[PDB]
RNA sequence: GCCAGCGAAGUGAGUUCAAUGGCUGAGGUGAGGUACCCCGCAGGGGACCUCAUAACCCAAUUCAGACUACUCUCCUCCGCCCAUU
RNA sequence: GUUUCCGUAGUGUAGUGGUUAUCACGUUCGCCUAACACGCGAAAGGUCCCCGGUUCGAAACCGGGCGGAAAC
């Protein structure tokens, strides 16, 4: 049940590299409706706190990141959407056809609603995120950053 | 968890035994706190002030034990040359003494204490030369030897 | 341990070395040329009533150094300021007012290195390769990033160079308040009123300030002792101290009274009836120093009543770079600074001032 | 009751020379010195540097005490060549 | 003791360069298979015996070693000094660089 | 369903974004096999009962939602008594037995039909 | 002011609060007092056991005592008492020239000729 | 290595209120905090509209440095002795979250181990007036250093008496000794309009403290820094902070 | 499952109202520099100068082992991204 | 050195031999009174000390990290 879920992997391959970026779109079109039918209030004056409390556990699978600050100064300024969610990396795949992964070790990701705009601090958001969505994310210390 | 402390020994020499008799744990404490206060500053009156406590006196005998720490100890043993002047309803002018300055371990800060007044007695025999005195040195070294 | 810190030390370093204006392997020329940043130069010559004509229009024609107020970073990166100053000459910037360990400052080198001094809240945000510069126990605050320029000239087109301008443009905006100026070595000539005309430059001149100090009490000074011979000559650690007190007007004798100044000369002296002072305050360009120290050079071609004259250049306390290597922070204090004590015999005291957290080339 | 070390101090303050390994002969002090040399060779690499004081900066082969193949052979050099 | 000059360091990063440039004998801090010069003259004071059992004695009071020399070793220094003392006789720990003086007695 | 209502969108949510994965580029499968491993995950951890119409498509194996329904073998066999439709997918090679017939009808109208008719608001 | 601490540092065991055996007789009444105010089992046979191991080394016969209170090291023979577990290296010196002690030295071997 | 941080404790009107940014933006102040004294005496609580900075500002604060306009923040320091007032305090989790630093002043050694174990506040006011002796123990620091709290070590001995040097400097050699010098603030409480001086003199007062050879310099610009940063992962939420941007 | 102790002087630290990791100078190793010297293969070595050497933490009868808190450092195994060919 | 126990709305504490968070005090409101102390109903208020692991789901069970408390 271990070894027989991960005989080759559950990872991608060369072929799904190039399946042309644009027509990716959708998923994030998917994702931009999801969040305008989980509060579906937005424009006058309705609780920022109420919506980056309920992003703690919204999965946030294909959507849009900017890093803006981290430790490297090469992981600084990668755009794009995410595919895959792990412990603490996730795969993402930006403008014409090339994955990177960014680890979150210790940065933040700048994702951009309709109209908000909400930091993740990486460093604190880890720990396989199906279990984000369950259960323990306490107060713990500051983010130096 | 625990602090480092240094204990160091006084001893009053002096003449006109009056002064002997007028020592408290209140004046003493009332005076080794004002005279940091007048030869150092503020600094050092109450950084030499969270350990500082009294714990030995004899005012017959006439040896002082204080409480200092690691960090402030040449402050106290600086301040010791500058008493004098010790005011009270008479006229009174003693000066302390240091001895050794003992680094904690109070059990060797006695020991110290017992071979400084084993040699006190002795030179006291031909010096003072007393028949009613020398009987109570053998009523001292008697006692000494059932402890 | 608590008392220790309270009358210890901080750290302070000077290098004195003798040399020869003559010798061949000489390195008076190239430890100005080198040294980037200058804000003070003053030059003392005792026994001078009368100043020479050439020397007197050396010192009004230090300058001109230029202020720009807001500039942004990515101005600085155009081929079009990179074609015009820094690929015909050498062009210098200093963010003014800018505290080398409260904000960010950024520093530019002749040989083409934009070496700039950010924060943490900078440096994460900019996406620049540096390296800390000052550890401060656990937490690093500090990040330098040296950028060279004339490599990036070569293929404007490479990915280096569209990291950087992509980073200053929209990534991440930062405008400052730049001490600018430019040597003119260069065939085609242009001047910075012309290309800065959008901003709000402004034209500075040098502050000039002509003094005569009389009945001064110089030392006796041997130039092949360092040390001092006892009774004879002085040593050349107690002219450094004995030099800054006559440039802030400080020549007093001994007054036992409530005020006593224990300010003592040092002795042996000689009593000097004339002294001439001088301060050139403002952006000081290193090569007009080399074209000041060769004049100085050339003062003794003729039999003069002096027998040492000085050269004392204080530099800035918010220079990130000097002398091609060292980061210069500040703790408490702390600047850098050169010294020139030029004798009759063509040979000269070299006194290298190092401040707190700074080392010390040869 | 003392053990090996015990045993060691037996013959160190009595002025001789302990009975295992630390005389030199032929077919008994060049194993035991050899497995000596294994011991604190393996002490030496398990230290990582600049903890340890460098050997070529202060002295010479040590504290590895085989030289005398060729010490003894040196000191016949200097003499008998002469 | 003077210094002595170490060149075998430059095949140091010699072989941590050619170790790491293989992958994408071990002489590293005081082994190498030369020790024929050495023997004859390295050390300023001239080394001629060893010390096997090294700790300092409960019975005397102080240091006392216990080690073996060799004969021409000792007869060239007892040739040199007919005079006082003669057994006066300098030790150099390996891991200090300070000489200090024993009294050599063979006691049989 | 105070605070389990906001994790009944976190669910189906993932369920739909693995249909548009291979609605667009099919052969290409690890989309697929990741966000039905994520919704797996979620209603193992935050217990809920999902219906048995959509969780025999889940295809329990490791997670395939989508594949055998396009790619892989379902058909209809007759093994002992009652015919069964067995899905079968190409990865884990796991079967699940389903019986179809009009003898049943009214049981096959138990699990799935009878809740269209009494789950009232 | 503790009774556990009276003792002898010769004298002293870690293991006083678990079972109470491990204390004088003396000594245990003030203790059952304190106690009102303050892993399996093994069944096989060791004999087998240490015959076993004895092909190895040689396993003398004294090995009992030192092992369970020296610190045991092999060497070019056996393992042999080398260190003792608590600190007595001035206590071994002090022990041979005032006191007495005595050893177990059976790595000698002795050759008969007749 | 944002530098020159304050916390004023100074409110009776706004001619002596706005002479203290003046001067502190003489200096070397680029951020200036202004703190709001509760007590449990009173139970009051002025959180709604309390000072109204862009209001009644005269638009421009100029400082030496970069010339940047000083971030004027309005913080929270809350006298605490009681157990039975603490819980007022407990409850503005959710009703008025203002007043984005917030500090507090324990009187009580089972009152100053909650707060730096259970209480979840920013900064911990340690101040001696008047003959206040108070044990300073290991496992209620050890916590702290780790979870980001830090220790307004406020000192202003020289407005009424030069007894009270005494008590600043017995104090803080105290928590030197034990603390060890991990994450600990000083500043002035300043309502004369002469009563604060450089930052660059204020860290030999921290070095009069001792603390270090060298982060006393940091315990006014690196320590402050992670103190303040501390007050905003509080303010919004502590793994996501949502900021409405309207160009 | 159950059953076995000795109040007696003095631990290569042995304190118990609870000692001891000290300073200065010279090195080692890890960065940086040379108008200095020698060997002559552009190279290398030596000499000299500046700086880092810590964090976690404290013996109370001792030892072996597991677990946990760690970085001035060295060794092994790799990942991500940048740039180059 | 030694042993056992404990951490639960604001305090004092239950409870659970694993899937629900509550009783007493106090606050708010309501019952009541010309306006009240009691009685009584109801609501605001949760990091169930922290992390990992077991299990379909740990306030709980286990492991580790702290913390707190009772006495020689
Ligand atoms: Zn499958």
Known sequence: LSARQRRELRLFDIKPEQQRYSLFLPLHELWKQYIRDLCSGLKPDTQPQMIQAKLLKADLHGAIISVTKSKCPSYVGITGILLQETKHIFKIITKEDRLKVIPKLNCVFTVETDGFISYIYGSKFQLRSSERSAKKFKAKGTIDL | ???????????????????????????????????????????????????????????????????????FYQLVWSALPFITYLENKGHRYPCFFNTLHVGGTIRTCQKFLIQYNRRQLLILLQNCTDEGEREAIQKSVTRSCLL | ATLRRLREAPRHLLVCEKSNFGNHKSRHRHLVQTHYYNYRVSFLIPECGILSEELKNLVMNTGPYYFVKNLPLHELITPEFISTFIKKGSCYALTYNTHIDEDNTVALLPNGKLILSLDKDTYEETGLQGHPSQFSGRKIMKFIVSIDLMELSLNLDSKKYERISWSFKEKKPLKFDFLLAWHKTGSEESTMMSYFSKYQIQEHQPKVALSTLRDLQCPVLQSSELEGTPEVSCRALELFDWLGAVFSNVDLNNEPNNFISTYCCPEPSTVVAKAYLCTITGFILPEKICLLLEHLCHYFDEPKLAPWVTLSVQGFADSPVSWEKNEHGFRKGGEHLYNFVIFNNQDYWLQMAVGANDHCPP | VGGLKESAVHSQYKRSPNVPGDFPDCPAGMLFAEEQAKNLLEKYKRRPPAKRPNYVKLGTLAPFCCPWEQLTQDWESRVQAY | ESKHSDPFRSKILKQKEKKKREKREALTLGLWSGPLPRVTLHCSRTLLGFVTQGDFSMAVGCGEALGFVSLTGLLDMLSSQPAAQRGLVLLRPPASLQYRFARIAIEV | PVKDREAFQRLNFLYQAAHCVLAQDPENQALARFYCYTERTIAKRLVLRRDPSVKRTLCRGCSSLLVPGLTCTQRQRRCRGQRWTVQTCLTCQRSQRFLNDPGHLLWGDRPEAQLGSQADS | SLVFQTLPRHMRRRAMSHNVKRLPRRLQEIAQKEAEKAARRCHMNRTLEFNRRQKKNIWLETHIWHAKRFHMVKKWGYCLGERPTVKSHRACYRAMTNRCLLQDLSYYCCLELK | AVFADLDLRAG???????????????????????????????????????????????????????????????????????????NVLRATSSRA???????????????????????????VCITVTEKLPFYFKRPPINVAIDRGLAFELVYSPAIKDSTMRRYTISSALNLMQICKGKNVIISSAAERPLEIRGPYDVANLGLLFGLSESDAKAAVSTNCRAALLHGETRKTAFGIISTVKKP
């Open chain 2, 1 to 71: 968890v625990r602090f480092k402390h240094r204990y160091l020994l006084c001893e009053l020499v002096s003449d006109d035994p009056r002064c002997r008799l007028s020592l408290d744990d209140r004046v003493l404490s009332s005076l080794v706190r004002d005279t940091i206060a007048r030869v150092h500053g503020t600094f050092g009156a109450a950084a030499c002030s969270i350990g500082f406590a009294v714990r030995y006196l004899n005012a017959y005998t006439g040896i002082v034990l204080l409480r200092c720490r690691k960090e």
């Open chain 8, 12 to 86: 009776s009107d706004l001619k002596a209120l706005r002479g203290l940014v003046e001067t502190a933006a003489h200096l070397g102040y680029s951020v200036v905090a202004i703190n709001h004294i509760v007590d449990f005496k009173e139970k009051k609580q002025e959180i709604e509209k309390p000072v109204a900075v862009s209001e009644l500002f005269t638009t421009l604060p100029i400082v030496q440095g970069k010339s940047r306009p000083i971030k004027i923040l309005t913080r929270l320091t809350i006298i605490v002795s009681d157990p039975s007032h603490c």
């Open chain 8, 97 to 123: 979250r203002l007043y984005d630093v917030v500090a507090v002043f324990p009187k009580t050694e089972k009152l100053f181990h909650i707060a730096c174990t259970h209480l979840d506040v920013d900064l």
